Amino acid sequence: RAQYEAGVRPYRETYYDPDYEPKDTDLLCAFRITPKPGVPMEEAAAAVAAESSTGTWTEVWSNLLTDLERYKARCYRIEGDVAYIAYPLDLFEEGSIVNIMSSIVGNVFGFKAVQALRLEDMRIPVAYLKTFPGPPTGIQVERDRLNKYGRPLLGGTIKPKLGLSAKEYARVVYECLRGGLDTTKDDENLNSQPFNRWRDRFLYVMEAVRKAEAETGERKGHWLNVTAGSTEEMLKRAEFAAELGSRYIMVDFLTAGFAAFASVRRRAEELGLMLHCHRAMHAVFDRQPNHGIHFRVLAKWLRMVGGDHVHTGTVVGKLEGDRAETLGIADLLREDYVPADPGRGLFFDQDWAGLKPVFPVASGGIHVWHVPDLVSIFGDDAFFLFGGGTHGHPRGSRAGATANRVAVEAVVQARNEGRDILAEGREILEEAARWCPELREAMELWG
Template sequence: MSDRILATYLIETPYPLERAAEVMAGEQSCGTFTRLPSETDALREAHAARVEHIEPLEASYTPSLPIPALQSGKVHPVYRQARVTLSWPLANLGTSLPTLFATLAGNLFELKELSALKLLDLTLPKPFAEAYPGPQFGIAGTRELTGITKRPIIGTIIKPSVGLSPNATAEVVSQLLKGGIDFIKDDELQANSPHNPFKERVDAVMPLIREHAERSGHKVMYAFNITGEADQMRDHHDYVVAAGGSCVMVALNAVGLTGVSQLRRHCQVALHGHRAGWGMFSRSPHLGMSFVAYQKLWRLVGVDHIHVNGLRNKFSEEDASVIASARACLTPMFDPPSPGYEVMPVFSSGQTADQAVDTYSAITSTDLIFCAGGGIMAHPDGIGAGVRSLRQAWEAAMEGIDVNVYAREHTELARALETFHQ
């Protein structure tokens, strides 16, 4: 088993591929633009990044991103793309996650030799699994907390995203509980606002959750959004725990890797990761980071759930990317695999009963949270019918029955397909 860190990138450059790759390796390890007296052969042997592999791809006469002009008089450049894999010795950084991020995704993105750069994947040696706790609950623990053992966990998001008071939020929760929901989450825009203070919201919602659990024997998981300053997040986490809650949520990109890592070590409940801002990394095919690499960092620091968007979603992400993201969450992370690093993908964004069969067909797993906002609350026969329509759609998917055939004997599903079919 290698003790080196590996990262694979998509690059584009007007320079020879080998030269561009060597510039990348030098910039992100012991090299600089010129050889230094202190940069001995022994130091380079011990600490230099290595170019492990170069796979040439297509070429064009137009750069994908702006790039400084080459010296005048040179022929019109060809911009060559390639997959490049670099590796670093663990000795360069140990198991420091902030330094890992600076190494994998630091100054590389500013190199003038590159007209495209995207981090596609990374492979970490086993010491990282020993240094970071990983998910505390993951798939198995989330199923135990919710009592949902085989099918997907059916969830929703409090809407409107902002504007509701604590009591108005509780009214929505009351309807969802009566409708048979499994999971509810705050919107990422609603954390601790003046119109809906966090602790007042917990005080309004948790008595309903507890009363419903006493009546039904089923404790609904509510992901309270605790995104904030580090001390505030710990305080709000503790308030949820004291109230009998089972989940807190953070906006990952807003809090950062070290913020989530500190929270995870303090956390006593499931940690729900929302990837708000993900488009900054992903939307350009020529710049940023793939979800395959991204989710590994958050699994390492210990989120139990992470959003992957959804099929036929309201955003710009294509279905193939969504499915690849979900599969990545369900793929073992270390070699050999480390137990406890499983993370539950969360499907959301314009999801209804209409997407259930295609989602199951694509990932062949029910280890997921399937969140629908309008797909539940806008069902023509009410919230309860919306929840039942989603369960019925997943029943059809899991049993291999055509959803339209199944809908003939399941009114809620039939009405949902009539209403939401795209």
């Protein structure tokens, strides 16, 4: 009965507020928009703000059923190519990444008005951040658990990615751990394959983990892969890994999905497990610099829901990466307050409100020669996964795992002495190779 003003109304007249000063309880977002020719930046930034919020392509009669200014998002700033949108606190459901990742980065990425759209960063407010559990164990409790301190913990994926039977899989695991690696892991595509089922693999591996742990006199582990086609199966494999006495489980937290990942994280904490999170399929999001979701957003989502490790990527490996952006991401997972650094891809000051940190895992195609670079970028609190750089040694996995361990020890020991690692990496590695034959074979094979 009551009459309103229906009709298609341009977005920027109610979803663009250049004079808006955000509160401390708002999810701010920094989109990198690329609009259609003839469509202005201001109007496109309003289209992104409206459709990840209370808006639509017309004016509806039910806009007067509620106070729309209490809930609408708005683009409060534009820096030429980057649009700053401030989302109210009430728009989101507590303790669910699946709600942020279905609202902010949902249907807005595929409009005809915007040719390209990348979500660069995002400011999680403490009010909404407090409703999350955070990583189950973190850095310090994990270092205590393994009884390893003051060095970057090593690792390595078991190669080839697939094909090895359960018996032969556990012999490679034994050689790596006995060689000197602190941990081995399953590969992202090895879950329950016919050539190597999971009950066979879980039992065989922990037999090799326990055997290697006893002889070498130090604590070991293996990131058994529990991801599967459903959450019930995923939780069933997590319990079996717990009853076997394992310390770790690994999950593909992007291919399995955030809801299943949050379900597994709760079940893993109740089982006293340490949950490594592999970032498989992230490149589909964040390879191109003009469209997608930058990993510093997916890294923020991981820490909130809870994850002991994630791959931040080696900037010198076979996978793409920027040294500056990785440095911001690495300190986005470990520090407690991260001031915004425009020179490091960071837009907003991120207070973490007591959530415990995360190991940045540095995996990729990294051999011994990359250790001087890797240590400087990350430091002590990191994992260096030499997957193919261990088994690729001229004399097997045991010799290779010894070379990686020596290379990390020599470089770190030199850092504490005071030497400049970047300029003296080759000198330090050759000093170590003067006494380590295993390193010498590897250091010249891949050099």
